[PDB]
Each structure stands twice: as structure tokens, then as C-alpha cells.
Amino acid sequence: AEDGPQKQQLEMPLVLDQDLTQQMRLRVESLKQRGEKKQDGEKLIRPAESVYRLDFIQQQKLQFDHWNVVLDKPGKVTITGTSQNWTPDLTNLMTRQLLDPAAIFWRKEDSDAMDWNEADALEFGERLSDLAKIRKVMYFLITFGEGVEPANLKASVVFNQL
Ligand SMILES: [Zn+2]
Ligand SMILES: [Zn+2]
Ligand SMILES: [Zn+2]
Ligand SMILES: [Zn+2]
Ligand SMILES: [Zn+2]
Ligand SMILES: [Zn+2]
């Protein structure tokens, strides 16, 4: 197997889930509004976090090839996955449903080139292939570091068709 471009691939984007990202925003507010307290080991979405959705156009015969994450302005972003068992409509996201490691990308003031934590990013990347089989859709929580926003990001995953 001599790697190259001739191989067939599938790029699947991480679309911003505004409805779901909003649902979690209320939740945090509701609890302040009602001076109420959150469940045990519950994950409350933060202002710097937004929920993203990844739709697996294919589930079988997948091999993680590489992440395709680009920031158009100097900053940092963390892509953390959620359990393929987490039912966003039925239950509140629990801290234990956040996957590890998270894939972290960044760009600096003098570079137009992205750098990241290769190891962890690959670990995470590898898992995605087997997660595609649990269910057709998957969600992630993307934490935008200071200076960046959803407008500045283009995230996707490239898989090799087997
Ligand atoms: Zn949605
Ligand atoms: Zn408690
Ligand atoms: Zn490649
Ligand atoms: Zn390759
Ligand atoms: Zn690890
Ligand atoms: Zn690590």
C-alpha cells in the first residue's frame, strides 16, 4: 500500500448546530434565572463553546485520513467530541460524555500555517471511524479561544473509502 492521491476519500464537514447550541444556552440561564442548581456531573455549555454536528454520509468502510481545520485569524480552538450515546433532546450532556483527547488547533500572528497537537488529534481521529458505526450523526463542542469565532472556522474530516 503506497499512500497517495489516487485513493478515494470522503470529506464530511462539522456544521454549526445553532438550535442545539441555543438549547444549551437557555439551560444555563434558566438555572440562574431560577437560582436553581445543575445536575450531578452535568456539562453546562460555556459562552466560548458552540455545538457542532458531523453527519456520516457513510458508516461502514471508513478510515480516518486527516483533519481539515482552518482558522482565518490568529487564535486557538478546541474540538471535543461527545458520546455517540448522548441524546441531546432527551438528556442533558454529562461531563462523562465528553471524549478525550480533544483535538486542539491554532494559528499565530506570523504564520498562515496551522499547528496542532498531532498525537491527541490522531488518537481522536482514529476513533471516529468506529464511532460512525454507533449512529449516523455525531456532535462536538468547539471551544473558541480569545480572538476567534465560528465565522473564522472551517472544520471537516477526511476518511478513506475501503
Ligand atoms: Zn440540530
Ligand atoms: Zn449534587
Ligand atoms: Zn492524507
Ligand atoms: Zn494518507
Ligand atoms: Zn490519551
Ligand atoms: Zn494529550
Curated annotation (Swiss-Prot):
The modification N-acetylalanine is found at residue 1. GO terms for cellular component: axon; cytoplasm; cytosol; neuronal cell body; nucleus. Uniquely associated with mature olfactory receptor neurons. It is found in: Cytoplasm. Keywords: Acetylation, Cytoplasm, Olfaction, Sensory transduction. GO terms for biological process: neurogenesis; sensory perception of smell; signal transduction. Belongs to the olfactory marker protein family. Interacts with BEX1 and BEX2. May act as a modulator of the olfactory signal-transduction cascade. This is Olfactory marker protein. It comes from Mus musculus.
